[PDB]
Amino acid sequence: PNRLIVDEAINEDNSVVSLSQPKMDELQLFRGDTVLLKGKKRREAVCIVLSDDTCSDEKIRMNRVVRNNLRVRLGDVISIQPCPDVKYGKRIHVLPIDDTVEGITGNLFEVYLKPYFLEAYRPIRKGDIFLVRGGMRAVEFKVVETDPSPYCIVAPDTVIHCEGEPIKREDEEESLNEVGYDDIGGCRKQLAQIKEMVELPLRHPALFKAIGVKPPRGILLYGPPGTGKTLIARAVANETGAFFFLINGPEIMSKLAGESESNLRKAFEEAEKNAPAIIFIDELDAIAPKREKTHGEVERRIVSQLLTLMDGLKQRAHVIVMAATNRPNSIDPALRRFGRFDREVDIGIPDATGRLEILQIHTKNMKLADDVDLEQVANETHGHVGADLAALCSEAALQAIRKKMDLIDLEDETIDAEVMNSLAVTMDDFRWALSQSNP
Amino acid sequence: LLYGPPGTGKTLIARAVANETGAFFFLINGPEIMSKLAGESESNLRKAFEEAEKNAPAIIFIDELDAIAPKREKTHGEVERRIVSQLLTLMDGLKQRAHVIVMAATNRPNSIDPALRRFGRFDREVDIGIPDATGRLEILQIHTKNMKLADDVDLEQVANETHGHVGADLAALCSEAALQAIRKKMDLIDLEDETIDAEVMNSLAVTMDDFRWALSQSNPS
Amino acid sequence: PNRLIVDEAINEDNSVVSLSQPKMDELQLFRGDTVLLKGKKRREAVCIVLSDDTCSDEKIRMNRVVRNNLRVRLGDVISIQPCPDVKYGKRIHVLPIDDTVEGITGNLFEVYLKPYFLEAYRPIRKGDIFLVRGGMRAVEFKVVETDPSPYCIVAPDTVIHCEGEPIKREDEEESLNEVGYDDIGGCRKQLAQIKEMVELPLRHPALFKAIGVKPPRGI
Amino acid sequence: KAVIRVRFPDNHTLEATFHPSEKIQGLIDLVKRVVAHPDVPFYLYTTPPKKQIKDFSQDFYSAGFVPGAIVYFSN
Ligand SMILES: Nc1ncnc2c1ncn2[C@@H]1O[C@H](COP(=O)(O)OP(=O)(O)O)[C@@H](O)[C@H]1O
Ligand SMILES: Nc1ncnc2c1ncn2[C@@H]1O[C@H](COP(=O)(O)OP(=O)(O)O)[C@@H](O)[C@H]1O
Numbered sequence: 001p002n003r004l005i006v007d008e009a010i011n012e013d014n015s016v017v018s019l020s021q022p023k024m025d026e027l028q029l030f031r032g033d034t035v036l037l038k039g040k041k042r043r044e045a046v047c048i049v050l051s052d053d054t055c056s057d058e059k060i061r062m063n064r065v066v067r068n069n070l071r072v073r074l075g076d077v078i079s080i081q082p083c084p085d086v087k088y089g090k091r092i093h094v095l096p097i098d099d100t101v102e103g104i105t106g107n108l109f110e111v112y113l114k115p116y117f118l119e120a121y122r123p124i125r126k127g128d129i130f131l132v133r134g135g136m137r138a139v140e141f142k143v144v145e146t147d148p149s150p151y152c153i154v155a156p157d158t159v160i161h162c163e164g165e166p167i168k169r170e171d172e173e174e175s176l177n178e179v180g181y182d183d184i185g186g187c188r189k190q191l192a193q194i195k196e197m198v199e200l201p202l203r204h205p206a207l208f209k210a211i212g213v214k215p216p217r218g219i220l221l222y223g224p225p226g227t228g229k230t231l232i233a234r235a236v237a238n239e240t241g242a243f244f245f246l247i248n249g250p251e252i253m254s255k256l257a258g259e260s261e262s263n264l265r266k267a268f269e270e271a272e273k274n275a276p277a278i279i280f281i282d283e284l285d286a287i288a289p290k291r292e293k294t295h296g297e298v299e300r301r302i303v304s305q306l307l308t309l310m311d312g313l314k315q316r317a318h319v320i321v322m323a324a325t326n327r328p329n330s331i332d333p334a335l336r337r338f339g340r341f342d343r344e345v346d347i348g349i350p351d352a353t354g355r356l357e358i359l360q361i362h363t364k365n366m367k368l369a370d371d372v373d374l375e376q377v378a379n380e381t382h383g384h385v386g387a388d389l390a391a392l393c394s395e396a397a398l399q400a401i402r403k404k405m406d407l408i409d410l411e412d413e414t415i416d417a418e419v420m421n422s423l424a425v426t427m428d429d430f431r432w433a434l435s436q437s438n439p
Numbered sequence: 440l441l442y443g444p445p446g447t448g449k450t451l452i453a454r455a456v457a458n459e460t461g462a463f464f465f466l467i468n469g470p471e472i473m474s475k476l477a478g479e480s481e482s483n484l485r486k487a488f489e490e491a492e493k494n495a496p497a498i499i500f501i502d503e504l505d506a507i508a509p510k511r512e513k514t515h516g517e518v519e520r521r522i523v524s525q526l527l528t529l530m531d532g533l534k535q536r537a538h539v540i541v542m543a544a545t546n547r548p549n550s551i552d553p554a555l556r557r558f559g560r561f562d563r564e565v566d567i568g569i570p571d572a573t574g575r576l577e578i579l580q581i582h583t584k585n586m587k588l589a590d591d592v593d594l595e596q597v598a599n600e601t602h603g604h605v606g607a608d609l610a611a612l613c614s615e616a617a618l619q620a621i622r623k624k625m626d627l628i629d630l631e632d633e634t635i636d637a638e639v640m641n642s643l644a645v646t647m648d649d650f651r652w653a654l655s656q657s658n659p660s
Numbered sequence: 661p662n663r664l665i666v667d668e669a670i671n672e673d674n675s676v677v678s679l680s681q682p683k684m685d686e687l688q689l690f691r692g693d694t695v696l697l698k699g700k701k702r703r704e705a706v707c708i709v710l711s712d713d714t715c716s717d718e719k720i721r722m723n724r725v726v727r728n729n730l731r732v733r734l735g736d737v738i739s740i741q742p743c744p745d746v747k748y749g750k751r752i753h754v755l756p757i758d759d760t761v762e763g764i765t766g767n768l769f770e771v772y773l774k775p776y777f778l779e780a781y782r783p784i785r786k787g788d789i790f791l792v793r794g795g796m797r798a799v800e801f802k803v804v805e806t807d808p809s810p811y812c813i814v815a816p817d818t819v820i821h822c823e824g825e826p827i828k829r830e831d832e833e834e835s836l837n838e839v840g841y842d843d844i845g846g847c848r849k850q851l852a853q854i855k856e857m858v859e860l861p862l863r864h865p866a867l868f869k870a871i872g873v874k875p876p877r878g879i
Numbered sequence: 880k881a882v883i884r885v886r887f888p889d890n891h892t893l894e895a896t897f898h899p900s901e902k903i904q905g906l907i908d909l910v911k912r913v914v915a916h917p918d919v920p921f922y923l924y925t926t927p928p929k930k931q932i933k934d935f936s937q938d939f940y941s942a943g944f945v946p947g948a949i950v951y952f953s954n
Contacts (some may be wrong), residue, residue, distance in 0.1 A: 005629065013927055025946060030882065032925070032949030048927060051945060058627055077629060088890065103870025119953065120927055137872045200618055204631050207621075212585060213614050261474070297516030304473035304506070311468060334470075334506070336660045338446055338607035344660060365872050397873045398860060407718065409665065409737055411864055436853075 002027075002079050006072055008181055009061035011050065012364070014130050015122045018052040018061035027082060034086055034123045034153075037062075038079040039070025046083065046123035046151045064180050068173070069129055073241050075203035086123065089152035091159055093145040098166035099175065100139040106416040109162035112139060115421075117154050125151035131176050135420040136366040136397065140176055142167055179235040184228070185358040186350030186386050191232065194219070194345055198278075198320055202240045205276050205318040216343045217313050220335075221324045223347030226387035229324035233280045242320075243274040249283030257298045261305045268309050271319045281323040288332045303332065310340045350386060352378055358386050362393040371427040380434060388437075396433040400425040440504075440543045440555065443567035446605035449544035453500040462540075463497040465490070469506030477518045481525045488529050488539070496538045504543040508552045523552060530560050569605065572598055578606055582613040592647050600654055608658060615653040620645045662687075662739050666732060668841060669721040671710070674790055675782050678712040678721035686717075689742060694783050694813075696741040697722075699730030706743065706783040706811045724840050728833070729788050735863045743811075746783065749818035751807035758826035759835065760799040769822040772799060777814050785811040791836050800836055802827055854879070881939045882947030885910065885923070897939060904935035910952075921954045 009018055017035065029035065029049050037045040045066050055061055060080065072078055096108070116132045124130065128143045144167075146152050154160075169175065184191060201208055201215035208215050221229040230246070237244035245267055255263055271277040281287065288303045313319055323341060325331055335341050350358065356378035363374065381389065404423055405411065441449040450466070457464030465487060475483055491497035501507060508523050533539060543561060545551065555561045570578070576598035583594065601608065624643065625631075669678065677695065689695065689709055697705040705726050715721055720740065732738060756768070776792045784790060786806050792799050804827075806812045814820075829835070844851060861868055861875040868875050883906060885893040893913065897906060911917040924931040925948070932942065939945070 016927060021945065030884070030947040030949060031944065032884070032886075051943060075626075075629075103866075118929055119924070119951070120929060121951065122927060196622065200622070207631055207635060210635055213617050215618075258476070291513070295515055297518055300516065300519070301473065304470045307470035308468070308474040311470065334503075338611065338660065342607075342611060342658075342660060344658070346657075394873050398875075401860065401867070402856065406735075409735070411867060413866075415866060415870065 002081065003077055004060040004080060005058065005077055006067060006074055007055075007059040007061045008074075009063050010052070010054070011061070012182070013063060014065050015047050015124075016050055016063070017047045017066070018050050018055045020055050020057040021051055021053060023057045024049065024051060027080075029082060034083050036081040036083040036151075037066060037070060038081065039072045040076070041071045043070055044125065044150075045069045045128065046086075046125055048123065064176055064182065065129070065131055068176065071172075073203075074239060075199060083151075086151070086153055087148055088155045089124075089146060089148055089158040091147035091161070092124075092143065092152075092154075093161050094141055095144050095163060095165055095167050097140045097142065097169060097175075099169055099177070100137075100141075101166055104135070104417045105164075105414045106418065108134075108139075108417050109160070111135070111418045111421045112141075113160055113162065117160075119156060120154060122154050123151060124154065129173065133365050135417045138176065138365050174238075178238045179231055181235055181239055183361060184232055184235050185361045186228075186354035187232070187347065188354075190345065190347055194232065195236065197343065198236060198240070201318065201320060202242050202276055202278070208315065208318070214315055215318075216320075217339075218310060218321045218323070218341035219343040219345065220341040221322060221345045221347060222328060223324075223326075224349075224385065225326055226385040227347050227349075228386045229347065230280065230282055233278070233322045233324075237278040237280075240278075243271070243277035245271060245277060245279050247279060247281050249281070249286030252287060252302070257301075260302050264302075264305055264309060268312070268319075272317055276318040279319060279321045281321070284323040284325050284335075285327075285330055288335060290330055290332060293330070303334075307334055307340070349383065355381055355384065355389060358389045359393070362390055366393075366397060367421070367424050369424045369426050372425060372430060373427065377430055377434065384437075392430070392433050392437075395436070396425060396430045399432055400429040403429065440545065440561040440564050441567055442545060442548060442564060444569070444605065445546055446607035447567050447569070448606045449567065450500065450502055451606075453498065453542045453544070457498045457500075463491070463494040465497055465499050467499060467501045467507075469501065469503030472507060472522070477521070480522055484522075484525055484529055488532070491539045492537050497540075499539060499541045501541075501543040504545045504555070505547075505550050508555055510550060510552055511554075513550070523554070527554055527560070569603065575601060575604065575609060578609045579613075582610055586613075586617060587641070587644050589644050589646050592645065592650065596647075597650055597654070611658065612650075612653050615656070616645060616649040619652055620649045623649070662741065663737055664718060664720040664740055666727065666734055666736055666738060667715070667719040667721050668734075669723045670712070670714075671721070672723075672842075674723055674725040675707050675784070676710060676723070677707040677726070678710040678715050680715050680717040680719075681711050681713065683717040684709070684711060687740075687742065694743050694746055696743040696811075697726065697730060698739040698741065699732040700736065701731040703730050704785060704810070705729045705788065706746075706785050708783065724836055724842065725789065725791055728836070731832075733863075735859065746811065746813055747808050748815045749806060749808055749812035751819055751821070752784075752803070752812070752814070753805040753821040753823075754801050755804050755823065755825055755827050757800050757802065757829060757835075759829055759837075760801070761826055764795055764797075764799075765824075767822075768794070768799075769820070771795065772801075773820055773822065777820070779816065780814065782814045783811060784814060789833065798836060880946075881944055883939075883944060884947070884949035886949055886951045888952065899938060899940045899945070901939065902935060903932055903937050903939075903942065907935060919954060921952065923950050923952060925950050 004019075009016065011018065017037075019029070023029070024031075031049070031051050033049055035047055035049045037047055039045065047062070047066060052061065060078070067073060070078060101108070112132045112134050115134060124143055124146070126143050126146045126149060130141050130143075132139050132141055181191070181195075197216060197219065221232070223229060234244060234246075247264075247267060252260055252263060267279065271279055288306060289299075294300060294303070310321065313321065321341075323335075336344075356375055359374040359378055377392075381392075384392070400423065403426070410419070441452075443449055454464060454466070467484075467487060472480055472483060487499065491499055508526060514520060514523070530541065533541070541561075543555075576594060579594040579598055597612075601612070604612070620643065630639065664679075669676065671678065677697070679689065683689075684691075691709065691711055693709060694706055695709045697707060699705070707722070707726060712721060720738070727733065730738060754773075761768070772792045772794045775794065784803055784806070786803050786809065788803050790801055790803075792801060812818075841851065857876055857879065881897045881899050883895050883897050885895070887893070895906075895909065907923070910921070910923070914921070922931050
């Protein structure tokens with residue numbers, strides 16, 4: 001069957017997909033062959049099929065780029081056609097995106113295309129969006145026009161023209177800068193369980209509407225601060241194409257008494273209007289302490305208001321509430337109700353493999369030296385949280401800049417991207433950054 | 440007054456009683472009353488009783504009494520004391536020409552304002568304990584009465600693997616098992632385009648395997 | 661090269677600077693020989709070089725005084741020119757600053773200049789600002805005019821004209837009364853840690869303007 | 880069997896069947912025969928991602944050319 005369901009890819013590439021050996025044997029697909037991908041909104045995409053034993057026959061593994069290019073999300077069905085006939089690119093015209101080039105002036109062609117395209121022979125089509133990583137960032141690019149039509153393969157003989165004129169972002173076309181499942185690391189089982197619980201409801205509200213079974217109204221996320229729960233919740237909402245509103249306990253607490261309730265009410269009403277939507281509470285503990293802990297009458301009114309809003313939430317509303325708390329001990333008894341936050345998710349400290357995995361995600365935009373080993377650094381950190389690793393990478397980057405760039409001190413006015421490209425982080429920098437560890 | 444742990448289902452019992460006895464039913468939710476501002480709150484309470492008297496015979500049920508009326512040592516608000524006072528005033532204000540039954544749902548006996556134990560007030564006290572195996576077998580039967588099961592499915596054995604599980608937990612365990620089954624069979628075919636008919640959903644059968652999966656999941660709530 | 665990076669000075673002297681032994685050998689600089697310093701805002705300065713093993717070849721050690729005089733801060737780049745040909749002062753005219761003299765009236769020439777400028781042969785340039793310490797305080801001064809142009813070397817034979825008229829403080833010109841690294845003691849590794857953390861962000865917004873790395877916001 | 884395609888720079892395709900037991904060396908030795916410049920040095924890489932195989936003893940199953948694949952030719 002040509003029909004398949006989009007799945008997460010293990011391989012991290014623009015134009016790489018993954019299918020089952022039998023599926024390839026069935027459709028007579030060769031490892032290097034180029035498959036044509038038909039999505040929704042009369043959009044088509046070109047990719048390179050690959051053989052993966054792990055992959056299930058009925059599922060296809062692909063990256064956030066092709067999904068966005070195809071305008072499809074997880075729990076949507078696509079159609080794959082073999083494309084035996086393919087001709088090389090003669091000429092290509094591409095213009096970068098305004099938001100990607102922000103704070104970069106100079107000749108970027110030599111430091112983006114040349115590195116990225118090095119006898120890659122990647123297939124592309126006119127009006128396709130692809131992502132290039134350089135200068136310690138991820139720069140999205142669009143295909144303005146191609147002499148060969150509709151699609152072609154990149155060749156070293158082929159001339160690629162790049163002009164320093166940005167194109168205005170299009171509100172239909174979501175950027176890749178957004179938080180994604182690939183951007184979340186150090187949790188496998190935790191993420192999977194969370195994904196499937198909210199998969200069902202958000203994708204098919206009409207099913208849940210026509211079924212007696214009710215979807216879980218409230219989901220609670222455990223674990224210490226710096227683990228990254230917001231980041232987990234945010235990615236899901238963006239990936240599921242559901243309206244995402246973030247509520248911050250301090251922000252709600254800051255507002256004066258009598259308005260706090262208004263703001264909360266406004267937020268919940270707004271979710272109903274833009275339903276299906278996801279509401280996320282960040283500092284739940286701050287909003288609602290324990291009954292013995294709270295000594296303010298006004299505080300009790302705010303808590304009561306939240307409880308009323310939670311009860312108020314219906315099936316028809318199709319709004320999922322996600323709350324984060326540091327410790328289970330500091331939880332209001334009332335919150336632990338089937339009606340309300342029935343669903344509870346325990347986030348354990350990430351394992352060494354998870355910690356290593358996190359490092360790979362943080363270092364994907366930046367340029368690493370051969371001598372630098374993430375595994376060894378991952379081994380040295382036992383109780384370091386995801387945030388700690390990011391801070392270490394940030395601190396290591398700053399040290400690396402101080403060690404090289406400060407000596408030159410040629411950073412006057414506009415800074416060339418290519419200079420930043422030449423900069424590489426040494427293993428010693430990481431060791432220097434690791435040395436200065438104290439919470 | 441109905442003593443029992445949350446989830447036991449006291450609201451459902453009351454609500455049902457009002458349905459089957461063909462008597463007007465009025466639900467009061469502690470937070471909903473607490474959400475309202477000082478003075479407005481008192482009004483709504485006063486507005487609820489008068490409306491119950493108007494539509495007599497009526498039933499007034501408090502979902503979360505402990506919240507409205509916690510113990511006097513635990514209350515630290517002057518306004519909070521005015522709301523309890525208003526409730527007590529509404530309870531003592533009730534006559535025999537009202538023909539209005541007041542039912543309340545609470546948890547622990549030690550989170551109770553002694554004021555509610557008055558002979559004139561909540562004299563009747565009903566200690567709803569956790570159901571035995573049979574009782575929970577009786578619940579599973581209830582929550583499997585619309586859905587289509589398999590011959591291989593044995594509630595007795597499921598009524599033989601939860602110990603400190605309440606009505607909600609079993610209802611949850613039913614929900615999840617059913618949702619899980621749909622993923623296992625329908626997410627693979629996945630023909631959820633436009634309207635969904637009954638004929639495709641009649642074929643849907645839940646295996647024991649579904650139940651085995653849902654049970655493991657740790658829920659201390 | 662003639663390009664170097666401003667660094668903290670160990671010596672507590674206003675008109676003294678230091679470089680590395682190798683750096684001196686490269687530019688054939690003599691320990692005593694006066695060095696001309698060009699910074700920013702078309703300003704120049706004259707100091708006395710020194711040899712420090714600790715100092716790096718590409719860095720230069722200097723005090724708060726010269727920074728102000730050159731209108732530069734730490735991390736900035738200055739140009740050093742050798743100045744072998746310098747002529748001795750004949751007539752010098754200096755007026756004190758209004759805020760510095762506050763609370764002190766009378767003849768200060770005998771108790772500020774005489775003590776400070778005793779057999780030192782200090783080099784100064786017209787329109788520069790120098791600090792003398794007297795009467796249990798720091799008193800800043802401005803060179804109004806010098807007979808030799810542009811710069812000159814203070815000599816015992818040279819006559820310095822002191823008249824009791826204060827010049828108005830200028831908003832561009834920052835006073836040395838202000839708190840500085842030199843004024844903070846009893847912190848080494850800690851000062852350094854603090855310094856290096858805020859060094860990049862504060863000096864160059866453009867670096868953090870266009871980068872994926874967030875600087876520390878709260879310390 | 881295992882289908883190995885060689886894509887030349889100058890829009891030339893060579894379709895050659897092989898056995899999963901047969902080593903990489905054999906194919907390289909075949910390519911040397913097929914090309915008119917054996918003395919000329921050449922390297923066979925598979926993209927994406929850009930990577931060449933320095934091992935001649937590595938079998939095709941292990942190499943991941945199952946059932947068939949295409950490899951580019953460069954000098
Ligand atoms: N799974 C993860 N993978 C990578 N980085 C993570 C992950 N979880 C958290 N982080 C990092 O932790 C930091 C804080 O994330 P989060 O916990 O959502 O915020 P907060 O600190 O307010 O609780 C961020 O800088 C983020 O990069
Ligand atoms: N490192 C230091 N070097 C010199 N003086 C210092 C230092 N740290 C503190 N002091 C002196 O200690 C006093 C108090 O310093 P500070 O802690 O900034 O203020 P306060 O004591 O009023 O809170 C001041 O007289 C200040 O000059």
